[PDB]
Design a protein around this ligand. Sequence first.
Ligand SMILES: [Cd+2]
Ligand SMILES: [Cd+2]
Ligand SMILES: [Cd+2]
Length: 31
Amino acid sequence: MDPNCSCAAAGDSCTCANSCTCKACKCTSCK
Ligand SMILES: [Cd+2]
Ligand SMILES: [Cd+2]
Ligand SMILES: [Cd+2]
């Protein structure tokens, strides 16, 4: 369930290099 952003999990491999989805991503790959 991706509400606004389900990244910054530390360890896991988020996919913010292809196409971001989070509505409120805070990853350095999408500011
Ligand atoms: Cd990410
Ligand atoms: Cd992102
Ligand atoms: Cd995110």
